[PDB]
Design a protein around this ligand. Structure first.
Ligand SMILES: C=C[C@@H]1C[C@]1(NC(=O)[C@@H]1C[C@@H](Oc2cc(-c3ccccc3)nc3cc(OC)ccc23)CN1C(=O)[C@@H](NC(=O)NC(C)(C)C)C(C)(C)C)C(=O)O
Ligand SMILES: [Zn+2]
Lengths: 177, 12
């Protein structure tokens, strides 16, 4: 269960694309590194929907080939938003395993092992500082088979060191749909 | 403005 990061564009391109809402870049992969002119986070594609956090994306539209992709789903209460995935985006599938051995995928393509300790919680096998996880919201929590368990939402930390992760569970992404 | 794709994470 390995991962690697690829850069698609710079900041100048990100700003102009943010303005026009028209993105003719080739889309590939399941985890999209998404950005605003100010903030950067992640977006995971599950069943043709590009899912991310509300605290990062807001009610903002997503830059697409035929123009701005309007939000298909907006749950402020669950801190979750979704867009119809842009062409080329490869999709992830919900987990049915019921496996407690989870894996969080970060913006720096690190596959950090998590151990499920509730519906929306999972403990970190090796605690990481809050900075290591910053900008990885919307990132996926994978089962050992590589199926979507949830989307990384918030960090459960004690004085700067993250000991666990809070995530939006796929069941709630299916409930939204 | 709109949320922009600026990179990707490819999974094995
Ligand atoms: C270290 C990185 C962490 C992952 C990260 N996340 C974030 O930085 C998120 C953002 C914000 O959390 C939320 C904001 C909003 C929200 C909604 C509407 C409008 C504005 C904000 N809704 C939430 C709903 C939630 O549960 C229902 C849980 C968390 C929601 C706070 N936070 C955290 O991670 C913080 N952690 C928490 O708040 N953790 C608990 C208490 C939820 C377990 C922080 C202290 C580490 C910064 C990021 O990368 O952004
Ligand atoms: Zn599974």
């Amino acid at each position: 269960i390995t991962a690697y990061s690829q850069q698609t564009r710079g900041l100048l391109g990100c700003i102009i694309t943010s303005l026009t809402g028209r993105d003719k870049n080739q889309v590939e992969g399941e985890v999209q590194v998404v950005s605003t002119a100010t903030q950067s986070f992640l977006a995971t594609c599950v069943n043709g929907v590009c899912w991310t956090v509300y605290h990062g994306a807001g009610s903002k539209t997503l830059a697409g080939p035929k123009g701005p992709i309007t939000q298909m789903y907006t749950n402020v209460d669950q801190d979750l938003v979704g867009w119809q995935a842009p062409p080329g985006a490869r999709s992830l599938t919900p987990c049915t395993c019921g496996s407690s051995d989870l894996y969080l995928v970060t913006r720096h393509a690190d596959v950090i092992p998590v151990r499920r300790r509730g519906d929306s919680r999972g403990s970190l096998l090796s605690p990481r500082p809050v900075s290591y996880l910053k900008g990885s919201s919307g990132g996926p929590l994978l089962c050992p088979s590589g199926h979507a368990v949830g989307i990384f939402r918030a960090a459960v930390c004690t004085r700067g060191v993250a000991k666990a992760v809070d995530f939006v569970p796929v069941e709630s992404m299916e409930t939204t749909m | 403005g709109s949320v922009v794709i600026v990179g990707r994470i490819i999974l094995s």
